[PDB]
Design an enzyme around this catalytic site. Structure first.
Site, mmCIF file in Angstrom:
data_model
loop_
_atom_site.group_PDB
_atom_site.id
_atom_site.type_symbol
_atom_site.label_atom_id
_atom_site.label_comp_id
_atom_site.label_asym_id
_atom_site.label_seq_id
_atom_site.Cartn_x
_atom_site.Cartn_y
_atom_site.Cartn_z
ATOM 1 N N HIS A 110 -26.557 12.104 -22.617
ATOM 2 C CA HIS A 110 -26.498 13.589 -23.019
ATOM 3 C C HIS A 110 -25.435 14.151 -22.244
ATOM 4 C CE1 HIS A 110 -29.828 15.401 -20.848
ATOM 5 N NE2 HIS A 110 -29.037 16.431 -21.118
ATOM 6 N N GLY A 117 -29.708 21.782 -15.322
ATOM 7 C CA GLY A 117 -28.628 20.857 -14.386
ATOM 8 C C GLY A 117 -29.814 20.008 -13.449
ATOM 9 N N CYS A 125 -31.044 17.327 -14.898
ATOM 10 C CA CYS A 125 -31.038 16.070 -15.580
ATOM 11 C C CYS A 125 -30.376 15.259 -14.650
ATOM 12 C CB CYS A 125 -30.390 16.331 -17.034
ATOM 13 S SG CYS A 125 -31.327 17.038 -18.071
#
Lengths: 300, 300
Positions: A41, A143, A145
């Site tokens: 993503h 942030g 991820c």
């Protein structure tokens, strides 16, 4: 003596954290050898996340659209591909700080450490459990991820988790390092049901052995029980059913404390149907299910 | 979102952990530059610990009596001296992995990370608080002595703690890196009183702001109070008295949540005199006092 929720030391994993940018999305990646692993993503905007066609979105992306940065130094990307929900970015430089490692899919109830990162920088480290419903109840801001979950086994890092999503319930879903989600979750901003989450009975039992080992004994009672009658009580309290594997796994702690598993099961039963009555156990006023028997043995 | 007890990443400190042996006692030391810092009781046997004369015991010891080992490599000791309860061992090799650092004496109520070690090897990492009575409620087995406590502030490690003693109550006492004990404790195996330990009211308040930030709001009530009437209630519950400094320190969280400090103080008051009634707050059934306002801001 004493008991804490302790993570593994994070230094081996720190040396593998990088920043990945594509378009205007920035998140973390994991640099091992000449491959950088990150959530797919990374290619999505906010809008894309509502209903991404990853295959089509990826097709607009070339190697040069991916900026990989390792502290101050940019890495050159010479290859990209999608493995399930992970993107693998081939770079020209092997990580000089690559530890010995492997990729493992953990089972519900096992525990691991998370190095929470922002823009490729380690922010902090804590111990997590894969819940039976395949969520984790972590600490994850925008942030975070691509932050990873791991266990260390002498010199060897076993990576088990990559953070991808916060769900509308404020709980956390993610993948293994081959990019297959834990649980039924997808990498889409839609409402997604975690099931009813149960307690990891085997882990609760291990913690009670830890408590006894530490001198915290008050909850020990005069009863015993059977696996079936325990489970009959477990089921009422959304406790995972206890099996003979669980019993065998506890045996070392059985032996150390001189307390049979079924005896400990009977004390737990009473706690379940009487509560803790204001007292604490290893300084908690709840029953803790985020320590495995291995985790108790290590610290005890 | 989500909330966890998170340690700082341990890698900078990992690279400074060594093994120190003298006679048959082995414990951990901290190698910065060309000095290795360790607990002076490294020179003591079990018997010595009952009533050590450190000055006399040290006088039987030369440089060559100290074996310093750094992974596989032995360091040559070219100098030894005692600073309060710390021994400083001058070695011929500067640590090539010495981070930027400083030595700080923290105040009761501030928090830090501990890298628990055995024989100079990192075992694990967790967040601690210096309790008001200058103990810590850590996790410390035989051979953990010389394990250090620290905070990281960008690139800079502030070492604040060295573990020396487990007391007969199963609680932990230690020094700063100049070797002065926190609290009234001495490096002797005799019975030693910690005082009555109080709750760090300012930290509890920060956690409630964290809870609200996380959406956990049920405990918010219809009252306010005064600093004096709060404190009058604090004192009954062995809560540290709240001051205007504490209020000022909470202000950023005040501003974020739109909840005035005294309003939060009134909700706490009710929790104190009503308990939690079975509910949980950030998944705990007690009030947590091991997060500073800085610690809440960082994670939130």
């Amino acid at each position: 003596s004493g008991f804490a929720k302790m993570a593994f030391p994070s230094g081996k994993v720190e040396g593998c954290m990088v920043q990945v940018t594509c378009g205007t999305t920035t998140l973390n990646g994991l640099w091992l050898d000449d491959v950088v692993y990150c959530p797919r993503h990374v290619i999505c905007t906010s809008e894309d996340m509502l209903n991404p066609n990853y295959e089509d979105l990826l097709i607009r992306k070339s190697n040069h659209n991916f900026l990989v940065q390792a502290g101050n130094v940019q890495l050159r990307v010479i290859g990209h591909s999608m493995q399930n929900c992970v993107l693998k970015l081939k770079v020209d430089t092997a990580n000089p700080k690559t530890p010995k490692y492997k990729f493992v899919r953990i089972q519900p109830g096992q525990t691991f450490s998370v190095l929470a990162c922002y823009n490729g920088s380690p922010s902090g480290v804590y111990q997590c459990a894969m819940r039976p419903n395949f969520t984790i109840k972590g600490s994850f801001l925008n942030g975070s991820c691509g932050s990873v979950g791991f266990n260390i086994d002498y010199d060897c890092v076993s990576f088990c988790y990559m953070h991808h999503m916060e769900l509308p319930t404020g709980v956390h879903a993610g993948t293994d390092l081959e990019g297959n989600f834990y649980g039924p979750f997808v990498d889409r901003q839609t409402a997604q049901a975690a099931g009813t989450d149960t307690t990891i009975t085997v882990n609760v039992l291990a913690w009670l052995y830890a408590a006894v080992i530490n001198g915290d004994r008050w909850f020990l009672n005069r009863f015993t029980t059977t696996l079936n009658d325990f489970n009959l009580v477990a089921m009422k309290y959304n406790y995972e059913p206890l099996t003979q594997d669980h019993v065998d796994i506890l045996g070392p702690l059985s032996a150390q404390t001189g307390i049979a598993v079924l005896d400990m099961c009977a004390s737990l039963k009473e706690l379940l149907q009487n509560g803790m009555n204001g007292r604490t156990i290893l300084g908690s006023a709840l029953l803790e299910d985020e320590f495995t028997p291995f985790d108790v043995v290590r610290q005890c």
